[PDB]
Amino acid sequence: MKDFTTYLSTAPVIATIWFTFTAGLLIEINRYFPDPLVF
Amino acid sequence: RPLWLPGSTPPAHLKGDLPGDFGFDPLGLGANAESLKWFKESELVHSRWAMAAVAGILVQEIVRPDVFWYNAGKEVESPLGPLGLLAVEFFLMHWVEVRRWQDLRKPGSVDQDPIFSQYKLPPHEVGYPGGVFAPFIPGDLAELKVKEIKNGRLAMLAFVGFVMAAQVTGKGPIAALQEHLADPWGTTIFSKAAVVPGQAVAPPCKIPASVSYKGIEIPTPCFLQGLWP
Amino acid sequence: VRPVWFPGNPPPAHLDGSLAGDYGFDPLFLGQEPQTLKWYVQAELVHGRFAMLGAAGIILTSIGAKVGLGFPEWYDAGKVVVEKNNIDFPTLMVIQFYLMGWAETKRWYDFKNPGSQADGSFLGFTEEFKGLENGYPGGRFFDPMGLSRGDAAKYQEYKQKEVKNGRLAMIACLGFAAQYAATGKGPLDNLADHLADPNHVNFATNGVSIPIA
Amino acid sequence: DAALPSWMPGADLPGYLNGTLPGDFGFDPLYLGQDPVKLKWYAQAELMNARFAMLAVAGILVPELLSNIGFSWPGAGVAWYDAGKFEYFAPASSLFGVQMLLFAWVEIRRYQDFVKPGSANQDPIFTNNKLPDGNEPGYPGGIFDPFGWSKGDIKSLKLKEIKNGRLAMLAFAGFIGQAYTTGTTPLKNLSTHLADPWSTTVWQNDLARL
Amino acid sequence: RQSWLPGSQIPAHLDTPAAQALAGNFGFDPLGLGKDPVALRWYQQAELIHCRTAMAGVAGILIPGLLTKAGALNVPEWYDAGKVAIENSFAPWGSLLAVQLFLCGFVEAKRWQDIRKPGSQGEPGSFLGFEASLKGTSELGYPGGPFDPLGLSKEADKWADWKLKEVKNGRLAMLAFLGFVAQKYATGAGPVDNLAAHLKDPWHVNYATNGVSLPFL
Ligand code: CLA
């Protein structure tokens, strides 16, 4: 399990998870707050 | 030594020192010393309360057969208001229960009369005050203690039976006994209900759900009617 | 030596039979690490206790619903309670989250630092939050009867009974969810329907479990 | 931690209460008197609050007691909470200012004697007039005790004073509570309760408004 | 050792003897903004100023507001008192703000120079002889002289207690004002009105029912 977690801690896996989280957050924000142009 | 199961081994924590010790503890609730010390007083208080309650219920039905004990809290009118009686009972019970609780947690600390300095209870054990509380002790103390705990256990089961019979048949203890003695084969709990994988029949709750007491609507539901057999 | 989940296969090295309900069941090696295993033990205990309470409540309410007592089903009890009594749903959510947050945060920081909640910073209580073992918080508050501080063998037997009953309750809660999602009725209604005709009223005839049936 | 009287026979009282202060019964569940300086200040605060509450309860109960009998005077039917908006020889503001100046003088003198015992026993105008050297804060004596009542059992009298003061403080709190709930004077509440105590209790009266 | 989270690891920068001498030390610093001792000293001064300013403002909002509920006063709401006060005033808000900025800048600059160099305001022949009283005590942010006229800071036995009553209260006041703003943007009424509305029915009048604090419910 330690080796598997270390593999999950590698740069491509971490980048994939982080970008999926960031993209999901932005998509959900644009979904609940459609068409945001100004503050 | 008599036991609750002849030929069985009593628990290690039950050495037969306390009165009424019959080696009955399958759950091991009395394994701890402090827990056993607290439960001993709990059993003694429960025993005395149940004994007085059962005797009172029987005398109530004998003297007043037209008044149901289950309805005794509703069909009794006194010049003293219910809230006043509740306040008096709350203050007196609070005083005596705090004194008893302090004696339990701190033995030999509340034996002195707070009003008169010339009155003090002699040294005793927790749960057995004595002194002014025991003006006459006819016979041995250990034998009488065993008799008291046995009568108390019987009275506890008797009160539970009183409540269940009053909720299932709607009659008092003597009335239920006479009704059972009239038709013994058709008045037992087995004759009133039965459960099978295809049908589950239970006796109806004779106690009404709501009781009107000076415009307050006190709810009076039968104890665990859903789990009734 | 001890019975394992799948007979004939040796148990894993990280499961030596010391914990309660140890049957060497870890094919994915999720609890291979010691700290992760400790965290998972506390998670399983919390899950089992919550599932036991949920299963007991569901069974009692279903018993009252089957007999003429007016009880609602478990899948409608929340709506019935919030509508029958003037109870605001977000307020109840916030109150529950406050109380659960306090209790769970104290339990969490006790897991991170064992015995740290016994310093007396919470109203002066010290021995009531010391904690006996991981996931087993003994004391006068959580164990007023003192069944964990007397007769060690009985305590171990009760630990095994607790973990097994918790696992069974978790399976029961999953069964409640699946039965409501498939049949659409209460659990006791499904039990009565099965007892009426067990050869034709089961999951093989509900039309949802087996689509090719 | 001795044979001194306690508010709970058998309870483990704190050790900072050794019976030095009058009416020590070891009653401090919140441990507010742990700090010796805080306890020293709280003793004087309790004494002052107790004496003012005693004067207040006496001044609330005496006019109502004399009003219920044939005795009559200008302010008779006015309640204790209604005496503020009464017509006097001077406006309330003027009396408030005069009393604030007078109380400022006496309170600063009392505080001076509290921070330094025996430093305020001398009369500023008449140098011959003074209080006895043996004195303690909160117990002036001298001209304040012209009858020499303190020459006897000072401990028993101090115990009586603190007990009566605590009872009067609770009585004033009860006066505020009864005036806010029943909206009637305290002696009228006492008469109403004495008419039929079984049906006139705090539970019954408060439940009738719920 | 009192902690803001029983069982949490207290930061090392908040466990030093110099940091432990600060009032209200509960080891609360998750972001680690006080790791630098100089930054910690500056933030301590900022916290003291915020505590005193918030206490004065919250008192000026709560006490007149509570007296307005009764018949003692008639002070308007804190969010509307500025307009009412400037209506029947002798100066516009701009001129008043300019005079205020000058008067506040003078004392704030003197306090800033004292923060940079403790006791530097006692330079002889610089403030018409009043410079002798402008030297603070041994603790930064706690000056004497003209400040503290009653001399309650001379007694050390209660000193450590007094500071504990100043920071804590100040922190509470700092939260109070924050609530005063949030409530104004969630109910549209004053703080006393919100308190009375909640006391009338707490199970239905709270932030879970205002429709703003919980947009997902
Ligand atoms: C000196 C203490 C004292 C005394 C002698 C009384 C006496 C009385 N109160 Mg009262 N009360 C008190 C304090 C006191 N109170 C305090 C501190 C409060 C809180 C602010 C209240 C709030 C209150 C309310 C809301 C009401 C009364 C009411 C009453 C009257 C009858 C019903 C009742 O007793 O309720 C119960 C009284 C209490 C629960 C107070 C607690 C007991 C106190 C602390 C005394 C402690 C007992 C001690 C051993 C002394 C015994 C008496 C002694 C002089 C011999 C009665 C004459 C009712 C009334 O006005 O009648 C119309 C009413 O509704 N009281």
Ligand SMILES: CC1=C[C@H](O)CC(C)(C)[C@H]1/C=C/C(C)=C/C=C/C(C)=C/C=C/C=C(C)/C=C/C=C(C)/C=C/C1=C(C)C[C@H](O)CC1(C)C
């Ligand atoms: C302390 C003292 C001392 C001094 O010196 C003297 C004096 C004063 C005398 C004292 C006192 C005492 C007392 C109080 C006593 C009491 C007791 C009791 C009550 C018992 C009971 C006891 C009681 C008991 C057991 C009871 C039992 C019962 C029973 C079984 C019942 C049964 C039944 C039922 C279920 C139901 C049905 O329907 C009927 C029947 C069948 C019938």
Ligand SMILES: CC1=C[C@H](O)CC(C)(C)[C@H]1/C=C/C(C)=C/C=C/C(C)=C/C=C/C=C(C)/C=C/C=C(C)/C=C/C1=C(C)C[C@H](O)CC1(C)C
């Ligand atoms: C071990 C392992 C590892 C390896 O390696 C792999 C594998 C195989 C994956 C594994 C396995 C796993 C599993 C089996 C899991 C499961 C779990 C569960 C089922 C849980 C539940 C759990 C469950 C739970 C908690 C539950 C609970 C419940 C509850 C609360 C309820 C509640 C309620 C009620 C009363 C009624 C009302 O009306 C409603 C509600 C509100 C709804």
Ligand SMILES: CC1=C[C@H](O)CC(C)(C)[C@H]1/C=C/C(C)=C/C=C/C(C)=C/C=C/C=C(C)/C=C/C=C(C)/C=C/C1=C(C)C[C@H](O)CC1(C)C
């Ligand atoms: C510690 C820490 C660190 C870690 O690491 C992280 C974290 C978490 C971030 C943290 C926390 C923080 C916080 C909480 C903060 C807050 C603060 C505040 C709130 C302030 C206020 C503060 C506040 C303040 C000053 C205030 C003040 C006020 C005032 C003046 C007022 C005034 C006024 C008045 C009288 C009245 C009129 O009519 C109006 C006006 C004109 C309006």
